[PDB]
């Protein structure tokens, strides 16, 4: 329709909720406009409708509202976002309004922000290897195009720097796969939820220096912005990413700054509505709500585009069993976990290899894709590093002077591994250099102890000395 209808008779305002009685004409999930007595207009959404009264959650703060003059008017029945190809290079707030001073976009379509589930028949397996330039990711936790790979961080760990480095250095290798094509760079969709100025300025300066702002769409919700707007931002960011990737064949990389703030914003609404909580007070439906965000990535059969997600989240008191990391690990296809101990020693990036995992690693590596010895080298490195870490605990009891000759080899291997393979700085290693370093690290062990590697590769790559690379 083209008319407008206003509902008066608000009977309850408290916190983020608002009740209106005679609003039975409002559809469930609709978007409404709340008009103040001074003319200010605020947004809202219906979360429960009945013939007795309707419940509306308010995005902005409730200061200045009164029960005598406030009125509620309908905007649209289903929350929709106007998208276009021209929003590349623009900046928007948490609810989609421009904040760069340019005039508003002209839509080509209006798409629901909640999205729709992808048909499992229409999906296809992600198999394209992506070279990030980090040895601990490229070799042992390989990332493929179309994967959801979050980063598990801490309070003082440099997760933002790692994400910026990955976005700067990411590329595919068509020469290894035999295609011979030259690709085009990823389009970036950046969604910030409760971000601070200290990190936002760093991200802006990094994107300005790398020149990636002309290919980027930014959704910013700052720390002093209203909390309830964080419900919408991931949905609109993923709607734009899906539209671009599956209508214009772009390769889209999506970064979400902090899902912990999103979970707190969800817990506020859940506690306001007296929902049955899960563990640590979070609402019981948080798994489904987190699933409606993560599973919007992947690849689609018969289409060139793709969506890749790199969420970032902070672990409270570095606890892996906290509900947010627990459900994120249950939903996503792996994780990258940073270590505080490696950070204290000065190692950058401080990626801990043992708790990290990549589920789609087997699809994108092997013969004809990267190299024939990738997986076995990764397995041998994992086993040897685990043995060295185990010996580190025996040393604290019996002393390192009482060790056998065999265990000292594992201890020195662990030390050299930490000091050379993980620690790389800002340099951009290729996959071949990372494999060369890995083979140079495996050469310090006896040839008969490489149980997980076939003799064919051992006879071809073993024997290279680490001083030949760094000397």
């Amino acid at each position: 329709d083209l008319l407008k209808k206003e509902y008066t008779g608000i009977t309850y305002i408290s916190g983020p909720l608002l009740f209106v009685e005679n609003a039975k004409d409002l559809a469930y999930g609709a978007i409404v406009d709340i008009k103040d007595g001074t003319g200010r207009v605020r947004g809202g959404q219906v979360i429960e409708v009945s013939e007795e009264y309707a419940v509306i959650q308010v995005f902005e703060e409730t200061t200045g509202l009164d029960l005598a003059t406030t009125s509620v008017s309908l905007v649209e029945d289903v929350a929709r976002l106007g998208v276009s190809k021209e929003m590349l290079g623009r900046r928007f707030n948490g609810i989609g309004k421009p904040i760069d001073g340019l005039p508003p976009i002209t839509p080509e379509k209006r798409l629901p922000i909640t999205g729709l589930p992808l048909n499992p028949v229409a999906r296809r397996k992600p198999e394209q290897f992506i070279q990030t330039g980090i040895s601990t990711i490229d070799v042992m936790n390989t990332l493929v195009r179309g994967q959801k790979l979050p980063i598990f961080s801490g309070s003082g760990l440099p997760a933002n720097e790692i994400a910026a480095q990955i976005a700067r250095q990411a590329t595919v290798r068509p020469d290894l796969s035999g295609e011979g094509e030259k690709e085009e760079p990823f389009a970036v969709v950046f969604a910030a939820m409760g971000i601070t100025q200290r990190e936002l300025s760093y991200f802006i300066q990094e994107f300005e220096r790398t020149g990636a702002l002309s290919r980027s769409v930014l959704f910013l919700n700052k720390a002093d912005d209203p909390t309830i707007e964080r419900i919408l931002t991931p949905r609109m960011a993923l709607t734009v990413a899906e539209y671009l990737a599956f209508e214009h064949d772009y390769h889209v990389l999506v970064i979400l700054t902090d899902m912990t703030n999103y979970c707190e914003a969800l817990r506020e609404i859940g506690a306001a509505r007296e929902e049955i909580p899960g563990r640590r007070g979070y609402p019981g439906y948080m798994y489904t709500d987190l699933a409606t965000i993560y599973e919007r990535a992947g690849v689609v059969e018969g289409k060139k585009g793709s969506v890749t997600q790199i969420p970032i989240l902070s672990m409270p008191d570095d606890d892996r069993t906290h509900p947010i990391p627990d459900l994120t690990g249950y939903i996503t296809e792996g994780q990258i976990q940073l270590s505080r101990e490696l950070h204290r020693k000065g190692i950058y990036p401080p990626i801990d290899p043992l708790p990290s995992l990549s589920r789609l690693m087997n699809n994108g590596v092997g013969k004809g894709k990267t190299r024939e010895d990738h997986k076995q080298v990764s397995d041998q490195l994992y086993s040897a590093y685990a043995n060295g870490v185990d010996i580190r605990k025996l040393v604290a009891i019996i002393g390192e002077d009482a060790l056998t000759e065999n265990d000292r080899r594992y201890l020195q291997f662990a030390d050299a591994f930490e000091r050379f393979f993980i620690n790389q700085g800002q340099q951009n290693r290729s996959i071949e250099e990372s494999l060369q370093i890995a083979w140079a690290l495996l050469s310090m062990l006896p040839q008969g102890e490489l149980k997980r590697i076939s003799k064919d590769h051992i006879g071809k790559y073993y024997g290279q000395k680490l001083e030949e690379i760094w000397g």
Partner: protein, 578 residues
């Protein structure tokens, strides 16, 4: 039938008024779009409906229509080589009616009404028919699909159709009472299909994994549970069981998990080979898919549909294996609905009746004599996803008290890339003593003795590890260091298995028996050598260790020569020490 109007909408729950006369658990049509619903509470003139589709955009006042029947599934030919959602709708035809996304209000039939099947009658006019008897035979992907009388239909045959090609809607047999029997029938998903008699379990369910087949066996009609934290190996193990097991028909239920896991099954299975028939592997598999971002209320329906289909294939004389990808998501969905019902919760917010549902789901398995006199079996393997790996969860504890086998996974073993990462200390099996008469006749006469010796060695190694943590490994005597090193060899050779390797992914029983015999022979020779005076540092450098340690990758057809060479090499190596 009863009609009403919508009174209140809140998420997945809809309250309708004017619903006097409606019955519990009937299927309703909600709104102008005709969304599928189910009544779960009656209160005066109002009824409480949960919706199996997304409820965004609905308005108060839309009509609600009750069908007067519970949730049911169509059972007949054409179910193999297909994928269904939580309420049995084919996804391959939703893929045609809609684009790459799944939308609301799509009405498709479970069985294709256009395809024609070669009908061959087996009954004659004047014959007495009864529930569970066969009416005819229809070929399907190398099987022989048998048309069955519905379980509660009795009468006498008036006329039958001659041999020919008909659709599933064609009435082939007409009874004297006027009831027509088609090629399919409908059955409520919450009623267990009746049988004649239950039987004891005496035949093993071969999985292809050494540790599960040898140490913790499960019988053909048994049940098992595999709990563990995220990243421990539950899905890979279940898919390996789907690939390599000796079941005739495999039913897979993806209750609330990732969609890429179902995509992998849809893509790779048509290229694999059925082990016992030689055809494509997907021709024996039925998939039920309800991913994480699908509507919440359909998770229970997927489980019930899967178990009902598995029982339907049981009645034809097949042995069916049913895999449930996660039974914890079912409990979470129950908790989410219980939140919308404002009822009193249990220990961790779950409804109090959760254990009754879990017990009723698991007790549908077993080996039976069907109503037609044939023999069938259904075995259920269900995964559990505890929050944060806490095994004291109510769902984990409820499952522990009804299953026959328990395969606990460990995160510490998965961290160091040791797979299948089964925790030997916390796992058990109750079918071990009943399968011995099968093992003695089909594998070897001394196989249970070898298995018990291996278990004793593992127990002794587990006993010594408390001292190794206390005073270090070097303080032990050589006779105990031998036990420690043999335990390490067993752990790194026999128990470890790679599911993605070209050869190691599948292992027959005789190969595992040969490996166990080689390990025990080496241990006996080493124990004899220590008392003679040889230091242990001499023994564990013999080249026969590499012969033992790489026997995993020897192919099945080449193993008998390798075994006979290694057994001679053991004696050749151990006589030259002292």
């Amino acid at each position: 039938m009863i009609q009403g109007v919508i009174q209140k909408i809140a998420g997945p729950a809809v309250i309708a008024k004017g619903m006097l006369g409606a019955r519990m658990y009937d299927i309703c049509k909600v709104g102008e779009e005709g969304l599928v619903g189910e009544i779960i509470r009656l209160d005066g003139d109002t009824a409480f409906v949960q919706v199996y589709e997304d409820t965004s955009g609905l308005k108060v006042g839309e009509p609600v229509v009750s069908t007067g029947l519970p949730l049911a599934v169509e059972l007949g030919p054409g179910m193999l080589n297909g994928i269904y959602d939580g309420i049995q709708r084919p996804l391959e035809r939703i893929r045609e009616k809609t684009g790459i996304y799944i939308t609301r209000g799509v009405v498709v039939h479970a069985l294709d009404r256009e395809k024609k099947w070669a009908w061959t009658p087996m009954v004659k006019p004047g014959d007495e028919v009864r529930g569970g008897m066969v009416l005819g035979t229809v070929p399907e992907f190398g099987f022989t699909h048998k048309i069955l009388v519905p379980p509660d239909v009795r009468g006498r045959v008036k006329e039958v159709k001659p041999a020919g090609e008909y659709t599933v809607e064609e009435p082939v047999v007409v009874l004297e009472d006027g009831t027509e029997l088609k090629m399919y029938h409908t059955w409520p998903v919450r009623r267990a299909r009746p049988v004649q008699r239950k039987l004891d379990p005496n035949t093993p369910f071969l999985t292809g994994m050494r540790i599960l087949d040898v140490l913790f066996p499960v019988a053909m009609g048994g049940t098992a549970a595999i709990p563990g934290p995220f990243g421990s190996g539950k899905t890979v193990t279940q898919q390996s069981l789907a690939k390599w097991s000796n079941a005739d028909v495999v039913v897979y239920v993806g209750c609330g998990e990732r969609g890429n896991e179902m995509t992998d099954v849809l893509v790779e299975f048509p290229e694999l080979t059925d082990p016992k028939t030689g055809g494509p592997l997907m021709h024996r598999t039925v998939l039920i898919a309800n991913t994480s971002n699908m509507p919440v209320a359909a998770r229970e329906a997927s489980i019930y549909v899967g178990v009902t289909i598995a029982e339907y294939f049981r009645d034809q004389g097949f042995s069916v294996a049913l895999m449930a990808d996660s039974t914890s998501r079912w409990a979470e969905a129950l908790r989410e609905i219980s939140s919308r019902l404002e009822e009193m919760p249990a220990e961790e917010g779950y409804p109090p009746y959760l254990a009754a549902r879990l017990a009723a789901f698991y007790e549908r398995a077993g080996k039976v004599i069907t109503l037609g006199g044939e023999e069938g079996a259904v075995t259920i393997v269900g995964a559990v996803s505890p929050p944060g790996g806490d095994m004291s969860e109510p769902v984990t504890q409820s499952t522990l008290r009804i299953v026959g086998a328990f395969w606990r996974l460990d995160a510490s073993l998965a961290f160091r890339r040791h797979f299948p990462a089964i925790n030997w200390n916390g796992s058990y099996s109750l079918f071990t003593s009943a399968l011995d008469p099968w093992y003695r006749e089909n594998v070897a006469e001394d196989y249970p003795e070898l298995r018990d010796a291996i278990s004793e060695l593992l127990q002794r190694e587990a006993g010594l590890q408390e001292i190794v943590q206390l005073v270090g490994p070097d303080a032990l005597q050589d006779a105990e260091r031998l036990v420690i090193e043999v335990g390490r060899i067993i752990r790194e050779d026999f128990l470890q298995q790679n599911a993605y390797h070209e050869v190691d992914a599948y292992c027959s029983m005789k190969k595992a028996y040969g490996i166990m015999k080689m390990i025990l022979a080496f241990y006996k020779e080493a124990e004899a050598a220590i008392k003679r005076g040889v230091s242990i540092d001499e023994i564990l450098q013999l080249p026969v260790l590499e012969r033992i340690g790489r026997a995993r990758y020897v192919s099945e057809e080449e193993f008998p020569a390798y075994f006979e060479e290694a057994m001679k090499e053991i004696q050749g190596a151990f006589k030259a020490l002292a």
